[PDB]
């Protein structure tokens, strides 16, 4: 609705930074509303949905198994690894690592799964093959969060991420059991409370994944809708602000409040 665009512009003003926004109808792929749809933004942890989508396509193809246990050691642990640090002794299965990477944004789990897949170049090859010629992963955790101005490495565009998310979630690329497993991990997100979830009405569905990075970068990709079903994809990215984490969260939650008021 154009009143949400008023709130996105107001957020650009309050944060003193670019905000990219898109609202996409999940059924038809129709772009309902957009602001900077084709400017690049750092993906940060929102790439971990894409990563487990690549993992699940290998599971579907018989090239990977969800129950396979990955062992790793203290040498692999990078900053913000709340779940992998606690499982050094016995390792974790592919399924556990995707739950940790999505639900808890665990950085080591993402690196371990990127190794399983053949690294950033293979996730980017996977994206290219499903028609996304924009999103690219170039580095590993934690480097990919750097968000240096004008750098195309590890970026997407709001319109590209929304279209890719839609394909992953409703297209024939993944088996329905796999699409459902990706949706379940996103629904179980534990780390995005102050963002769209704080504006979500009772009874609504949300599956999402947040990200934060350097230079004020913050973002969220989400599939949400009334009556327990997703019917729209919302993607929101910001970078460049010098505002605190709480101010960045606050403005994204106010963009959410506007889009839900005007649904």
Please give the structure tokens belonging to residue 40: 């690049």
228 CB-contact burial (10 Å; exposed 0-12 / middle 13-18 / buried 19+) = exposed
Please give the structure tokens belonging to residue 26: 């999940």
Reported structure resolution in angstroms: 1.9
Compute CA distances 28 → 98, 131, 175, 205, 231, whole Å. 28, 17, 20, 19, 10
Closest listed residue to residue 156, CA positions, set 42, 23, 241: 42
DSSP secondary structure letters along 95-122: HHHHHHHHHS--HHHHHHHHHHHT-HHH
174 CB-contact burial (10 Å; exposed 0-12 / middle 13-18 / buried 19+) = buried
Residues 186, 208 contacting (CB under 8 angstroms):
yes
Q: Into how many domains does the chain fold?
A: 1
Task: Find the angle CA(94)-CA(141)-CA(169) to the nearest 5 degrees.
Answer: 50
Q: Cα–Cα distance between 87 and 93 in angstroms, integer?
A: 10
Select which of 3, 38, 85, 143 is catalytic. 143
Give the list of residues 6+ apart from residue 224 with CB closer than 8 angstroms, or none: 196, 200, 204, 205, 206, 207, 208, 230, 232, 234
Element at 10 (helix H, strand E): helix 2-15
Q: What phi and psi, each to the nearest 5 degrees, are found at residue 79?
A: -55, 145
Please give the structure tokens belonging to residue 116: 């399983």
Q: Is 23 a catalytic residue?
A: no
Closest listed residue to residue 4, CA positions, set 242, 262, 241: 262
Residues 157, 39 contacting (CB under 8 angstroms):
yes
Select which of 33, 34, 45, 99 is catalytic. 45
Four-point Cα dihedral 146, 108, 191, 252, nearest 10: 20
Query: Tokens 């487990």 belong to which residue?
Result: 52
Compute CA distances 108 → 102, 138, 192, 229, 242, whole Å. 12, 16, 19, 32, 27
Domain with 99 in it: what CATH number?
A: 3.40.710.10
Alpha-carbon torsion (50, 52, 54, 56), positive or negative:
negative
Question: What count of other Cβ atoms lies within 10 Å of the Cβ of residue 211?
Answer: 23
Technique used to solve these coordinates: X-ray
Please give the structure tokens belonging to residue 95: 């399924």
Q: Is 64 a catalytic residue?
A: no
Q: Cα–Cα distance between 147 and 117 in angstroms, integer?
A: 24
Question: What count of other Cβ atoms lies within 10 Å of the Cβ of residue 48?
Answer: 28
Q: Cα–Cα distance between 222 and 257 in angstroms, integer?
A: 14
Q: Cα–Cα distance between 203 and 175 in angstroms, integer?
A: 27
Element at 24 (helix H, strand E): strand 18-25
Closest listed residue to residue 155, CA positions, set 88, 235, 97: 235
Show binding-site residues. 209-211
Element at 224 (helix H, strand E): strand 218-225
Give the list of residues 6+ apart from residue 180 with CB closer than 8 angstroms, or none: none
Compute CA distances 96 → 105, 122, 139, 141, 226, whole Å. 12, 21, 22, 18, 29
Show the domain range for 164.
1-263
Task: Find the angle CA(36)-CA(164)-CA(178) to the nearest 5 degrees.
Answer: 150
Show binding-site residues for substrate. 209-211
Q: What phi and psi, each to the nearest 5 degrees, are found at residue 134?
A: -120, -55
- Tally: H helices and E strands in the chain: 8, 9
**214 conformational bin, left if phi > 0, alpha if psi -120 to 50, beta if neither:** beta
DSSP secondary structure letters along 128-186: HHTT-SS----S-TTGGG---TT--TTEE-HHHHHHHHHHHHHSSSS-HHHHHHHHHHH
Which own/partner contact pairs does 132-139 have at CB distance under 8 Å and 24+ positions apart?
132/156, 132/160, 132/163, 132/164, 134/40, 134/160, 135/43, 135/47, 135/50, 135/160, 135/161, 135/164, 137/43, 137/47, 137/50, 137/51
């Amino acid at each position: 609705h154009p009143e949400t665009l008023v709130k996105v512009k107001d957020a650009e003003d309050q944060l003193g930074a670019r905000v990219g926004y898109i609202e996409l109808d999940l059924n038809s792929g129709k772009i309902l509303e957009s602001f900077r749809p084709e400017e690049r933004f750092p993906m940060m942890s929102t790439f971990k949905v894409l990563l487990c989508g690549a993992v699940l396509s290998r599971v579907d193809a018989g090239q990977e198994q969800l129950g396979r246990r990955i062992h790793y050691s203290q040498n692999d642990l990078v900053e913000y690894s709340p779940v992998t640090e606690k499982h050094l002794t016995d390792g974790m299965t592919v399924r556990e690592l995707c739950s940790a990477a999505i639900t808890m944004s665990d950085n080591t789990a993402a690196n371990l799964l990127l190794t399983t897949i053949g690294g950033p170049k293979e996730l980017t090859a996977f994206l290219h093959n499903m028609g996304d010629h924009v999103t690219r992963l170039d580095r590993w955790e934690p480097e990919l969060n750097e968000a240096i101005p004008n750098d195309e490495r590890d970026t997407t565009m709001p319109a590209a991420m929304a279209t890719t998310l839609r394909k992953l979630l409703t297209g024939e690329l993944l088996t329905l059991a796999s699409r459902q497993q990706l949706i379940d991990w996103m629904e179980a997100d534990k780390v995005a409370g102050p963002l769209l979830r704080s504006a979500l009405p009772a009874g609504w569905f949300i599956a999402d994944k947040s990200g934060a990075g350097e230079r004020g970068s913050r973002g969220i990709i989400a599939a949400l809708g009334p009556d327990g079903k997703p019917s729209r994809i919302v993607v929101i990215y910001t970078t460049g602000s010098q505002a605190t984490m709480d101010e960045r969260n606050r403005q994204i939650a106010e963009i959410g409040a506007s889009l839900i008021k005007h649904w």
